[PDB]
């Protein structure tokens, strides 16, 4: 992302929606739901807060933090070796190698019995109130406004209170701005393009940045002169 | 220095380095050495 | 004689990106990230402008001067051979 | 950009808009909102003000300037070496190289414990009231006029107070002028074309412009004669 | 341009617009705005006045003339060496080459501390009144007339006071005459085609006319006889 | 042009127009305006009068003839060497070659301080009243008739006083006659085709016709027999 | 015989750019920045003018004179061979 | 109607060309090294 994620409170979207006389019955209760829906449907990683938190494994199982939504990586606390997805179907079940993990709910199923693991996970930036906190990027705000507008007009059109042309125009505008926001939050910055360039041009390829925490994904690959 | 495998970056361009690494320095490929070596070997056999 | 000239439109350079640094990283990586959902492409995307703005490839200011040069070279070879024949001094006879 | 960004006040755009009797209910509030929306959607880098400001890192974290929107670069104050983006997931977290940075909100996550860094960022040219300040390039003014008109006519058409043909014409005009503005602000000038020319034609390629502040990116590459 | 830019005052366009009974409420106030809009949207360089004016640099900064719209070039007053666009992100900021420049508003950011620089810039030809002065080329006048007509008919059509066929015809005519004017003011003259020819046919290419003020872009390239 | 440009008075075109009862409200004023518009839009060089007139340069500037419209060439009075166009941006501005020229208004910017120059320019054949004088070529008269009729019917159709089919037919006829007139005035005659023939077939190419006044452009290229 | 001639339309040279410097930088870089959203392309983009004005490529004034030259050269070889045969003095007999 | 038509897709990667490129590069570098050492292929056998 070229731009920065300056955070603002949720009713900044209701500043903008309620200009429209047909969206005057929207509330913070509706804003919260549709904003979470938009955050998830877009799936932009720059909107989440990067956090690292260590837990202990009792026996191939560990308690997971409360605010976790996705896991960037899991590693062993003492070695630093990263973990992979567990393809095994019989992990903690005995009969009569390289470590791995799996996460479903509040439980993480590792292949280690008793060890501490570091989890780099993503969460949502919250407000002083326990509510989501949205970027103030006007592209993001306009796209979220159009999302909420499109949902409300879909309801009104199912009722027959909106002309079909109106809903078609709203959907068209929302689709274009959804593409625009997706590209805005995804296209690399200049500093990120240096990382991508250092990853791309490698006379001797580096294919083991997963073992580390992708620390050296972006380091330059310096060849000595002979 | 060219014959011994050393390239001076100041001899072929204006330098706007002193670290011996290709991402800013330039490789040398001794392709002129054989051209001299054939002649010097012929000198010995004359 | 100058080589092929490419007509390049910069309507898909991403936001907040200079043309200079964009082209520099395009050189280095051989991959140029583009933004197809720029505000300028809204007309073509939404159907309010002709779709030729998002398609049709890139033009080329190309001139077939190489064929002219080869024609001149062939003519020079022919005339030199003709003079050699007239003088009775053939190519095999000069060397 | 060929032309120069001479700054003028926001109510210029209302002087141009309110000539349309269907747009007499616009205010400075709506002008401000849709002007910010337009500036972000176009994302033209010549509209923002380049600034440089040094900060001190406490422990892999630093305070960020208030008016920051996007970061051109980050470097070290003493050495001048530029900082790439962070690819790491476990930056400051210990267990039991190349510098990098990362920015989310008002905080910058760098990979250095105690150092000062220079940040080259972009902000908005502000007014003496404290309001956004827009260029006077009549292409920009016309495209912003059409942006605001398009939003207003979209709202009216949603109520059903504007014919569909009028809105279609407004959208078509705005689309063409958006393309015109994007080409106006992005196509290099003669001096920028000299910089691009010196960057393109290089017998010995330069692939380390990022270590410097892209200072020698446009420097002409001279070859000694022999 | 084959033809010459003979200057005439702005109300020469109102001579011609007000023949139409539907354009009788146009004024010099409206003529000025739409004429400036047309001048900028067309971006023809033959319409601007070429001026040269020297300024002094205090410390990487200099005051810019009042009437500047675009900069043809900047050079050092003593050497005559031309300046390039500044790719550097940290120009006037120190830590603990070839000259360049950058211009945003009334300030020019050069890479030199204390020197005088010559700026060849473009402005607008004014009248005895402080108003724009337009070419009398009937192609230009007809295209500007059609621009103002098209804008006014767009307003009236948004109001519903003009048939859509009328506006479609006006837009078609304006589009054709806009293309015609663009070609008229761009296609080289015979004397300009000699310059282009001298630039084009060069057995030994000349690629350093930017250092000079493009003085020798058009000189013939004479090869001695051996 | 095959035919000769015999001059006739402006009211000939009103004699032809006013036969249409829908065009009885035309006047000599409208004839003059649309005749100038048509002459400029077609841009036929055979309609303008070739003149030569010498001026004196004061210091890189010279006074320009009043009736000038386009310059064929500029040369030096003493040597006869033709002047190319200016590519310079810093012509007369000193710091602390090939001659060139540049024309904007009533002033000619040349690269010579104190000399006299000959300018070959084109103007309009004027009437004893002092009015434009048009050719009698009935193709030209018909196309001008259709131009004026098309403008008038466009105005009426804008009011809604003309059927769309009538205007469409008028535009179609005018388009075809515009093409016919352009081919009539531009296709070379037999003697001009001899000049073009002598220019095309050249065993030893001549690429210096501009230094002379394109005098030997049509000169036959003779080869001695051996 | 002159080479191919390209018919070039300058309808997409960017604003504020002279033709001479545009073609110069086109020579040097082999890349010519164009402006697909010039005010003169408004008709073709907006559907008011024929779409061929933003398409159809660049025409060429090409004459097939090389084939004529080859035909004459081949005829000259044939006549010289006939004359040699009739004189009883073959090519191998001259050298 | 594409569900009774359109053929069967293929997950095809053009890796053979990459392998050929690397092999050709290896031959080129070995030839360069032989030439610089002054020991030609015909001179090894």
UniProtKB/Swiss-Prot annotation, chains A, D, E, F:
GO cellular component: virus tail
Keywords for the protein's UniProt record, in alphabetical order: Viral tail protein, Virion
Main location group: virion
Subcellular location: Virion
Task performed by this protein: Forms the tail multi-ring barrel with ring protein 2, ring protein 3 and ring protein 4.
Quaternary state and interactors: Homododecamer.
Other comment: The barrel is composed of five stacked dodecameric ring structures. Podoviridae-like phages usually possess only one such ring. The tail is thus rather long.
This protein's name: Ring protein 1
Curated annotation (Swiss-Prot), chain H:
Localization terms from the record: Virion
Residues in coiled coil: none
Subunit-structure text: Homododecamer. Interacts with the Cargo protein 1. Interacts with the major capsid protein.
Function: Forms the portal vertex of the capsid. Probably involved in head assembly, genome packaging, tail attachment, and genome ejection.
The protein's name in its UniProt record: Portal protein
Organism: Bacteroides phage crAss001 (Bacteroides phage PhiCrAss001)
Interval of the full protein contained in this chain: 505 to 549 of 806
């Amino acid at each position: 992302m070229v731009n920065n994620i300056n955070w603002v409170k949720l009713p900044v979207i209701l500043d903008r929606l309620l200009r429209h006389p047909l969206l005057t019955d929207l509330n913070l209760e509706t804003a919260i739901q549709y904003t979470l829906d938009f955050i998830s449907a877009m799936g932009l990683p720059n909107v989440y807060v990067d956090k690292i938190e260590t837990i202990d494994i009792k026996e191939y199982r560990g308690e997971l933090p409360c605010d976790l939504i996705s896991i960037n990586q899991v590693r062993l606390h003492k070695n630093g070796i990263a973990l992979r997805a567990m393809t095994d179907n019989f992990n903690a079940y005995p009969t009569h190698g390289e470590p791995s993990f799996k996460t479903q709910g509040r439980v993480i199923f590792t292949s280690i019995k008793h060890e501490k693991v570091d989890i780099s996970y993503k969460a949502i930036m919250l407000d002083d109130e326990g509510l989501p906190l949205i970027p103030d990027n006007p592209i993001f705000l306009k796209t979220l406004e159009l999302y909420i507008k499109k949902e409300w007009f879909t309801i009104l059109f199912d009722m027959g209170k909106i002309s079909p042309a109106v809903l078609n125009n709203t959907q068209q505008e929302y689709a274009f701005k959804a593409g625009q926001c997706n590209n805005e939050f995804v296209i690399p910055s200049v500093s990120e393009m240096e990382a991508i360039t250092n990853m791309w041009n490698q006379l001797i390829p580096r294919v083991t940045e997963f073992r580390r925490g992708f620390k050296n994904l972006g380091d330059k690959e310096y060849i000595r002169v002979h | 220095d060219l014959l011994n495998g050393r390239l001076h970056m100041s001899d072929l361009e204006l330098v706007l380095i002193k670290a011996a690494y290709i991402p800013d320095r330039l490789q040398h490929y001794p392709i002129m050495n054989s051209k001299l070596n054939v002649l010097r070997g012929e000198e010995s056999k004359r | 004689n100058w080589g092929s000239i490419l007509e390049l439109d910069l309507s898909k350079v991403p936001k907040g990106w200079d043309v200079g640094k964009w082209m520099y990283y395009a050189r280095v990586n051989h991959i140029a990230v583009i933004d197809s959902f720029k505000e300028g492409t809204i007309g073509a995307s939404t159907g309010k402008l002709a779709g030729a703005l998002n398609n049709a490839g890139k033009g080329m200011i190309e001139t077939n001067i190489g064929n002219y040069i080869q024609q001149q070279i062939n003519l020079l070879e022919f005339i030199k051979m003709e003079m050699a024949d007239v003088a009775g001094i053939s190519k095999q006879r000069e060397g």
